[PDB]
């Protein structure tokens, strides 16, 4: 996260870390939506162009963390994966359209003051909150600059941008399964997600019922916090039917 701050303890209890066993390294961010399911971005697991195709056994999921590099004994939990499901129409060839994946954990995790799931949005909530100008929050242990990594979880709040503006900021083909967010060059404020943040959550707080909903997944951007550029996120509500389906099928 670029131009964001350190998170408070228990601020994002649904934040998950995809950790690689060999080398032992932070791979991406992810979110806890159940006691057995984690949601991430499909490109963190499968990205053929760079020869990336991770399987269950190569990953570890670490929940309840604050510090990036320390094993927070008695606070975080480390789970192994049972299965990984990538969206059948994930488009890695052209624009990362439907960049979503679900990971089933070997055993359920127990919630605590640091481990608690996020809510997935419903048509009404998506409708009322996904409007340009409205701010959301992104979190992660990703780079602090385009061109190092923070010691604890970082957070930044960004406004959603009008689709026209998003499309006119890049050459890539934007689909209805993505939305972009960030401040405009004539806004003063800055902020953006960056490498290492991919896979994590873009969430909003409902003013109707006080709950936090995950509206997007960090998907891509060109550079980090560049002016005239925005971060793109997978539109979780449009892919919800797929989510429901694998979760009530497996």
């Amino acid at each position: 996260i670029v131009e964001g701050s350190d998170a408070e303890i228990g601020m994002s209890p649904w934040q998950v870390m995809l950790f690689r066993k060999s080398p032992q390294e932070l791979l991406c961010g992810a979110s806890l939506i159940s006691d057995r399911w984690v949601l991430t971005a499909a490109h963190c697991l499968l990205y053929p162009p760079w020869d990336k195709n991770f399987t269950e056994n190569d990953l570890l999921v670490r929940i309840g963390k604050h510090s990036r590099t320390r094993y927070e004994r008695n606070i975080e939990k480390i789970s192994m994966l049972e299965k990984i499901y990538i969206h059948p129409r994930y488009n890695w060839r052209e624009n990362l359209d439907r960049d979503i994946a679900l990971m089933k954990l070997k055993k359920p995790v127990a919630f605590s003051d640091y481990i608690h799931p996020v809510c997935l949005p419903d048509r009404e909530t998506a409708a009322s909150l996904l409007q340009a100008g409205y701010k959301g929050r992104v979190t992660g242990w990703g780079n602090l600059k385009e061109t190092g990594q923070p010691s604890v979880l970082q957070v930044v709040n960004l406004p959603i941008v009008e689709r026209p503006v998003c499309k006119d900021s890049t050459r890539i083909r934007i689909t209805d399964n993505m939305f972009c967010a960030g401040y405009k060059p004539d806004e003063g404020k800055r902020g953006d997600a960056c490498e290492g943040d991919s896979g994590g959550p873009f969430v909003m707080k409902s003013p109707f019922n006080n709950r936090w909903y995950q509206m997007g997944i960090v998907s891509w951007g060109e550079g980090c916090d560049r002016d005239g550029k925005y971060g793109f996120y997978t539109h979780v509500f449009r892919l919800k039917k797929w989510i429901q389906k694998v979760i009530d099928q497996f």
Binding site: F19, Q24, E25, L26, L60, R68, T69, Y71, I78, M80
Partner: peptide
């Protein structure tokens, strides 16, 4: 720079 985790989690 990641501190090691319990061997038990690699398996």
């Amino acid at each position: 720079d990641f501190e090691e985790i319990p061997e038990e989690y690699l398996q």
